[PDB]
Amino acid sequence: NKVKSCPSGEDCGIGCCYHGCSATDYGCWDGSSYAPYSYTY
Amino acid sequence: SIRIGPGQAFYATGDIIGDIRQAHCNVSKATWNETLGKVVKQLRKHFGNNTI
Amino acid sequence: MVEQMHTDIISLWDQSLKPCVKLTPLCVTLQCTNVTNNITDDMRGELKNCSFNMTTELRDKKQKVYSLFYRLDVVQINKEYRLINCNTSAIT
Amino acid sequence: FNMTTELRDKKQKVYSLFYRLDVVQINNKEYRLINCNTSAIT
Numbered sequence: 001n002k003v004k005s006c007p008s009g010e011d012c013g014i015g016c017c018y019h020g021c022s023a024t025d026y027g028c029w030d031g032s033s034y035a036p037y038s039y040t041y
Numbered sequence: 042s043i044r045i046g047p048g049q050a051f052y053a054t055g056d057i058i059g060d061i062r063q064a065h066c067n068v069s070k071a072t073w074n075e076t077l078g079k080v081v082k083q084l085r086k087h088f089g090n091n092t093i
Numbered sequence: 094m095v096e097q098m099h100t101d102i103i104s105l106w107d108q109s110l111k112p113c114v115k116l117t118p119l120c121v122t123l124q125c126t127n128v129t130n131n132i133t134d135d136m137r138g139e140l141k142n143c144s145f146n147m148t149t150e151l152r153d154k155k156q157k158v159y160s161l162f163y164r165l166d167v168v169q170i171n172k173e174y175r176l177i178n179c180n181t182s183a184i185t
Numbered sequence: 186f187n188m189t190t191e192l193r194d195k196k197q198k199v200y201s202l203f204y205r206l207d208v209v210q211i212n213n214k215e216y217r218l219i220n221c222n223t224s225a226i227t
């Protein structure tokens with residue numbers, strides 16, 4: 001299936017992150033880095 | 042066409058169709074050789090009749 | 094005289110907008126709901142209460158803000174909405 | 186590469202072909218454009 005659910009956080013095309021994606025960066029506002037996505041099949 | 046932002050897009054080179062060859066130019070050989078002979082004679086008028 | 098007036102009115106319009114604040118940072122995902130507080134039948138669905146994560150004076154700080162928009166200015170993407178201008182032009 | 190899209194918050198993964206002369210290696214797979222350390226490009 002490869003659901004790409006982003007279990008916790010805002011789902012942006014390059015990652016998932018608990019704090020939302022930053023409009024002025026390629027990271028997340030407070031989280032800085034993007035988290036990997038969980039997948040189901 | 043890859044959109045960057047509102048009203049703005051970047052144009053990316055896509056997959057090449059067919060074989061990939063390099064760029065090149067074909068200069069006519071006889072014409073070029075005659076042209077250089079003419080250039081050399083005119084240069085000799087300034088640098089000497091027996092200058093290599 | 095009509096062509097010159099047309100050109101000059103457009104030129105004055107653009108001169109007036111040229112030095113004003115750009116709203117490029119607002120082309121972000123909006124989370125919108127219907128405004129249902131004392132809404133008449135004629136206005137149901139006309140106003141969207143849209144929340145978004147906006148920048149602040151400092152680049153490393155964000156704020157969660159909301160604004161009411163008219164239905165005609167906001168287009169649904171895929172409660173997620175964007176401004177109608179996001180796929181055409183920057184707005185001043 | 187990871188580049189922005191119509192919205193500022195969401196990003197996209199895209200690809201493009203480049204000629205060797207336009208791309209300079211940094212740090213085997215990590216590269217930048219030759220213009221990154223000297224000027225913005227139009």
Ligand SMILES: *[C@@H]1O[C@H](CO)[C@@H](O[C@@H]2O[C@H](CO)[C@@H](O[C@@H]3O[C@H](CO)[C@@H](O)[C@H](O[C@H]4O[C@H](CO)[C@@H](O)[C@H](O)[C@@H]4O)[C@@H]3O)[C@H](O)[C@H]2NC(C)=O)[C@H](O)[C@H]1NC(C)=O
Nearest residue numbers: 005006007008009010011018019020122123124144145146
């Ligand atoms: C402004 O930014 C803040 C953060 O800085 C942001 O808050 C975040 O919102 C996301 C979702 O909008 C939250 O993540 C959620 O966590 C719950 C956990 O129960 C999930 O259920 C959520 O949705 C899941 O399920 C959906 C239905 O199946 C799926 O469609 C979805 O993809 C998920 O799988 C979601 O993961 C996150 O926790 C908050 N963060 C904080 C700190 O509160 C806020 O939404 C942003 N606002 C705007 C208007 O952009």
Ligand SMILES: *[C@@H]1O[C@H](CO)[C@@H](O[C@@H]2O[C@H](CO)[C@@H](O)[C@H](O)[C@H]2NC(C)=O)[C@H](O)[C@H]1NC(C)=O
Nearest residue numbers: 054055056057058061186198199200201202203
């Ligand atoms: C360039 O690299 C990509 C991989 O990064 C090659 O594969 C395609 O990548 C795109 C990404 O947008 C996918 O949508 C396609 O499905 C991929 N192709 C396949 C067969 O899965 C791509 O073919 C490469 N192109 C060249 C000319 O080398």
Ligand SMILES: *[C@@H]1O[C@H](CO)[C@@H](O[C@@H]2O[C@H](CO)[C@@H](O)[C@H](O)[C@H]2NC(C)=O)[C@H](O)[C@H]1NC(C)=O
Nearest residue numbers: 014015016026033034035036037186187198199
């Ligand atoms: C696009 O961004 C993502 C997120 O930063 C990159 O994926 C990360 O790659 C590093 C490599 O060291 C991993 O440690 C992270 O765990 C990855 N995170 C995620 C969410 O995948 C990705 O490589 C970037 N793509 C490009 C082309 O630069």
Ligand SMILES: *[C@@H]1O[C@H](CO)[C@@H](O[C@@H]2O[C@H](CO)[C@@H](O)[C@H](O)[C@H]2NC(C)=O)[C@H](O)[C@H]1NC(C)=O
Nearest residue numbers: 208209210211212217218219220221222223224
């Ligand atoms: C911008 O980056 C390029 C790429 O590194 C620099 O070019 C190099 O400069 C050094 C120092 O003169 C040379 O030894 C290298 O041969 C050059 N080429 C490469 C590929 O490294 C360039 O000097 C940089 N310019 C500025 C202003 O920083």
Ligand SMILES: *[C@@H]1O[C@H](CO)[C@@H](O)[C@H](O)[C@H]1NC(C)=O
Nearest residue numbers: 066067068069070071072073
């Ligand atoms: C260039 O192409 C034309 C055909 O369009 C050909 O007639 C001509 O001989 C070519 N010249 C060279 C130098 O290859």
Ligand SMILES: *[C@@H]1O[C@H](CO)[C@@H](O)[C@H](O)[C@H]1NC(C)=O
Nearest residue numbers: 070071073074075077078079
């Ligand atoms: C160029 O022309 C000269 C005669 O002017 C000749 O001797 C020479 O061999 C020619 N070179 C080539 C490559 O044809």
Ligand SMILES: *[C@@H]1O[C@H](CO)[C@@H](O)[C@H](O)[C@H]1NC(C)=O
Nearest residue numbers: 082085086087088089090091
């Ligand atoms: C060089 O050759 C030309 C004939 O092409 C002749 O008129 C001229 O006097 C010569 N000059 C010398 C220095 O031999």
Ligand SMILES: *[C@@H]1O[C@H](CO)[C@@H](O)[C@H](O)[C@H]1NC(C)=O
Nearest residue numbers: 125126127128129137138139
């Ligand atoms: C807003 O109004 C529209 C009218 O078509 C309706 O479909 C939608 O579900 C309403 N949403 C909320 C949150 O009331």
Ligand SMILES: *[C@@H]1O[C@H](CO)[C@@H](O)[C@H](O)[C@H]1NC(C)=O
Nearest residue numbers: 168169177178179180181182
């Ligand atoms: C932009 O978005 C609108 C609304 O979904 C759509 O009608 C239009 O075709 C899109 N593309 C443009 C303006 O190039």
